[PDB]
Structure 1
């Protein structure tokens, strides 16, 4: 009985390594080369892996997990009982794979054109406009155009996607797909825990929002910025206003303490995408962690193709389930944002390598937020003025308080501004999945959350047929998003614990854990667990305690909170958006 269960997981592990490796290879080839051929074979390999999943998942459901004594075997078999999309009947499974593929393809090839003019892709062209234009109308053209061409074209698929992904979830014992996604955290109190963390960060976000709104008022004019209202969503330097770092030049706390633009110095010094990933590899090995294998450098796609191929340019990391082949796919641009993304993706590779000897069912992060967090932790050290100067990307600061507050603002525009966005994406999608939001009010309920959580308003009134969620990668690609909210909270917890392990004293935001073998050992022991234990055990190994907590993130930004409160009080800012119904008159 116990011997039958052990033999089962042994056979599942052997056969899954082969099948999953074959699937990963075919998926890699569509993603690196969107064509009709690679499309069809990807859809074919989907049927091979589904057959395997159904064979073993059906066998796994014959075990009463209640009677199994070994907890590791209990845990694997319980997981194999979830067939995911392979629970669908054959006709629905084919339709679902086709719909996912059609949504991804529609998003990846959408363009925005001038009449009798050029056509712009999202990356790099429209992203560059959002980051660098300071003209209200040119930002509006890019912001509206992308929603017109990407978002509106996803709407035709999305109701059927919702129906099929919910049906698969119900066939695996869940009430809807959002219930299935939340279950990955194995935390009954998840929704309440996340709400409490969100509320703890409101003082920082409200003060940053009010300070940035004032600066936008100065640049874009009083007729276009309501000082008691929400901020127009196209003015924050980013297509989704999810990170605000590209308008640093409009909101510098101390303009008398200017700084080299990192991106500008990288190009002046001939940085290349490969050099960016080599620096990330060196940071991991400086901690005593593992280097990426030689195979990685030969097989990864670290820059957009030059030969015309359509590709998915979205940065991602790939485990091929043989313990030796790991790869990144990134349309890397030489700038600071993509330097951080490169570290993000290398953190995934490190996790793959740390848990490669576990059964494949357990080759995942302690929870999805842990997987997204590892690389971001190291990038916090990389981003310090001290580290950037050692890369010859910044002059020496010298402890200047003005430079220090300027650095904290730059970090806040990335990290604090992202918190409400990362909260609201799946607040919206959980309610689509549970039927609270129907297709009649997809877009209206999205904007109600954009207002409630981020304090933003659309610059152009939305119309019937708009589907602005469709204009954000993770929606058509069906990638859960709450993992990034969790990641952004716990990465500061991990930074604080690793800084303490390395003996750093003084303000947390001055810490750089480069070359700390003690910090590497904390990360490695936790990453080796994979998904073999509830995630509080990995939290305990890294931080010395078992809970998610915003206290580290608050500690990191405390000098900035103090400065923002004094600055906002001086100007009499009304925090929040009491005039929440304001929208642009012109």
Structure 2
């Protein structure tokens, strides 16, 4: 029984390489060239990969996993028994694939237009407005417009999507799609684990929220900001108020210690998207990690085409299942934000290259959070004033608190957002949230976790979750919450491995071969072992922990508490029922 099992795995892995490589090609071709033709080829390749999955999945289910000796074979066969969407009947499957395509296409081609003439796309036009405008009504136009055009358009598809993804989940042995998604972590205590981590970051978030709220009150006026209520969702510098770094200039702790305009610096010095990815490549190689192949530079789409082409702009990293072909697809803007994004995506590429010699079933991160965390770890060092000054993008305790605030606006603000997205989706999937209250429940969570309110009352027909990429694209989100916790654990451990002393936020692991080695050994494991092993290899312990993130921001927590107390802030939003009058 063991001999037939390993033979099966061998056959599965060699055939999967071929069909998945074919599928990836067609998917890439659509993502980088949205047309009726590339659509039809993709949907046809969807049938082909479903045929393969069904064939091998059906075989896999005939194995009694319980009777298998080898644990690696056991692990692979167990995973192949999950057919995903391929479990659906033929008619259901073609409908599901069409629904996903329609949702993705709708989101990626959505535009917000001025009556007079000009039509804005999310990247870069609406993103730029949200980042730079300091005018209440202009931010409102972009915020509401995006939700009116992208969000509302997704609503027609979503209930059927939910029905089909849940049906597929049940046919694969889960109770619903959220159950299926959570299972990717192989952690029965996941929901409690994440709840505890969220709670530990409360003091930091609430203090940041209160301080930022006070600064908004100062700029946007007392009539538009309730100092005891939620913050209007359009004022945080980001379409989804998920990260707040673009309003740094409104909240800077010590304006007497000014920072160099990084965007202006990058543009004047002739940075290009290509150069940004080259700098990311250099950072990885400085650690002794792998360079991207020449093929990467030849085949990647690192900027929005002027080709006339319609594309999916949202940054992604692609593994073509042949151990040679790895690509990034990103509509890169020349700014600091996208330089960080470039590092993030390059971390995904590094992961692909590190586990390329494993059987494809195990060519995944230790858990999806790990995959998201790699690039972010390096980006933490990239972001240090020391490293930015070395890149000629920047030029005391004041600057120190300023830096920590800047980092908090990104990292701390994202904690509740990244937590809530799948809190909402899991309840959609399990039936707790029906289509009659999709939006109402979304805003309940936006209030409960983030302390945000919508600037304009929502109406029936609104589907604000549809205005966030991962919703119509069916991309799980809890990975980003996990990523943000564990990236600081990795940072702390790699900094210690690099022999750095002093405050964690001052550490820069550039050129540390000891740091590179720890990351490499963990990444090489792919999905071959439960994630605590990869955690152990990097950090010397097996748990997720908020401690490293708390240690990193400790000096900011102290300053924020002092600042908030002297201004008499009431932390939180006890008047949670407050909305803009």
Q: How many angstroms does 1:117 deviate by?
A: 2.1
Q: How many angstroms does 1:116 deviate by?
A: 1.9
Aligned residue in 2 for 1:228: 228
CA distance in 2: counterparts of 1:50 and 1:106, whole angstroms: 24
3-state SS of the aligned residue for 2:510?
coil
CA distance in 2: counterparts of 1:392 and 1:349, whole angstroms: 26
Q: How many angstroms does 1:114 deviate by?
A: 1.0
Q: How many angstroms does 1:261 deviate by?
A: 1.8
3-state SS of the aligned residue for 1:184?
helix
Aligned residue in 1 for 2:145: 145
- In structure 1, stretches of 5+ residues that fail to align are none
Instruction: For residues 483-506 of structure 1, give each alpha carbon's deviation from its aligned partner in whole angstroms, at most 9, with x where no partner exists.
Output: 000000000000000000000000
Q: How many angstroms does 1:561 deviate by?
A: 0.3
Aligned residue in 1 for 2:113: 113
Instruction: For residues 428-471 of structure 1, give each alpha carbon's deviation from its aligned partner in whole angstroms, at most 9, with x where no partner exists.
Output: 00000000000000000000000000000000000000000000
CA distance in 1: counterparts of 2:430 and 2:141, whole angstroms: 34
Q: How many angstroms does 1:215 deviate by?
A: 0.3
Q: How many angstroms does 1:337 deviate by?
A: 0.5
3-state SS of the aligned residue for 1:75?
helix
Instruction: For residues 60-118 of structure 1, give each alpha carbon's deviation from its aligned partner in whole angstroms, at most 9, with x where no partner exists.
Output: 00000000010000000000000000000000000000000000011111111111220
3-state SS of the aligned residue for 1:318?
strand
| TM-score calculated relative to the size of structure 2 | 1.00
Q: How many angstroms does 1:200 deviate by?
A: 0.1
CA distance in 2: counterparts of 1:174 and 1:259, whole angstroms: 51
CA distance in 2: counterparts of 1:261 and 1:427, whole angstroms: 37
CA distance in 2: counterparts of 1:109 and 1:49, whole angstroms: 26
CA distance in 2: counterparts of 1:24 and 1:514, whole angstroms: 33
Instruction: For residues 164-219 of structure 1, give each alpha carbon's deviation from its aligned partner in whole angstroms, at most 9, with x where no partner exists.
Output: 00000000000000000000000000000000000000000000000000000000
3-state SS of the aligned residue for 1:317?
strand
CA distance in 1: counterparts of 2:242 and 2:122, whole angstroms: 16
Q: How many angstroms does 1:388 deviate by?
A: 0.3
CA RMSD of aligned residues (A): 0.6
CA distance in 2: counterparts of 1:263 and 1:483, whole angstroms: 29
3-state SS of the aligned residue for 2:416?
helix
CA distance in 1: counterparts of 2:566 and 2:422, whole angstroms: 37
Aligned residue in 2 for 1:164: 164
CA distance in 1: counterparts of 2:178 and 2:259, whole angstroms: 44
CA distance in 2: counterparts of 1:300 and 1:475, whole angstroms: 25
Aligned residue in 1 for 2:243: 243
Instruction: For residues 323-381 of structure 1, give each alpha carbon's deviation from its aligned partner in whole angstroms, at most 9, with x where no partner exists.
Output: 00000000000000000000000000000000000000000000000000000000000
Instruction: For residues 10-33 of structure 1, give each alpha carbon's deviation from its aligned partner in whole angstroms, at most 9, with x where no partner exists.
Output: 000110111110000000000000
- In structure 2, stretches of 5+ residues that fail to align are none
3-state SS of the aligned residue for 1:440?
coil
CA distance in 1: counterparts of 2:178 and 2:108, whole angstroms: 25
CA distance in 2: counterparts of 1:429 and 1:541, whole angstroms: 32
3-state SS of the aligned residue for 2:16?
helix
List structure 1 runs of 4+ shifted beyond 2 angstroms: none
3-state SS of the aligned residue for 1:439?
coil
Instruction: For residues 213-238 of structure 1, give each alpha carbon's deviation from its aligned partner in whole angstroms, at most 9, with x where no partner exists.
Output: 00000000000000000000000000
CA distance in 2: counterparts of 1:461 and 1:470, whole angstroms: 17
Q: How many angstroms does 1:262 deviate by?
A: 1.3
Q: How many angstroms does 1:129 deviate by?
A: 0.6
Q: How many angstroms does 1:567 deviate by?
A: 0.2
Q: How many angstroms does 1:264 deviate by?
A: 1.5
CA distance in 2: counterparts of 1:117 and 1:36, whole angstroms: 27
CA distance in 2: counterparts of 1:174 and 1:548, whole angstroms: 25
CA distance in 1: counterparts of 2:117 and 2:48, whole angstroms: 45
CA distance in 1: counterparts of 2:130 and 2:523, whole angstroms: 37
2:420 pairs with 1:409: no
3-state SS of the aligned residue for 2:241?
coil
CA distance in 2: counterparts of 1:117 and 1:35, whole angstroms: 25
Of residues 258-267 and 38-47 in structure 1, the stretch that sits farther from structure 2 once superposed is 258-267
CA distance in 2: counterparts of 1:112 and 1:324, whole angstroms: 40
3-state SS of the aligned residue for 1:243?
coil
Q: How many angstroms does 1:515 deviate by?
A: 0.3
Q: How many angstroms does 1:307 deviate by?
A: 1.1
CA distance in 2: counterparts of 1:128 and 1:17, whole angstroms: 40
| TM-score calculated relative to the size of structure 1 | 0.99
Instruction: For residues 290-333 of structure 1, give each alpha carbon's deviation from its aligned partner in whole angstroms, at most 9, with x where no partner exists.
Output: 11001100000000001110000000000000000000000000
1:555 pairs, out of 551, 556, 567, with 551
Instruction: For residues 491-544 of structure 1, give each alpha carbon's deviation from its aligned partner in whole angstroms, at most 9, with x where no partner exists.
Output: 000000000000000000000000000000000000000000000000000000
Of residues 114-123 and 567-576 in structure 1, the stretch that sits farther from structure 2 once superposed is 114-123
Q: How many angstroms does 1:2 deviate by?
A: 0.5
Instruction: For residues 255-306 of structure 1, give each alpha carbon's deviation from its aligned partner in whole angstroms, at most 9, with x where no partner exists.
Output: 0000102112100100000000000000000001011001100000000001
CA distance in 1: counterparts of 2:323 and 2:128, whole angstroms: 38
3-state SS of the aligned residue for 2:185?
coil
CA distance in 2: counterparts of 1:464 and 1:89, whole angstroms: 33
CA distance in 1: counterparts of 2:408 and 2:262, whole angstroms: 16
3-state SS of the aligned residue for 1:578?
coil
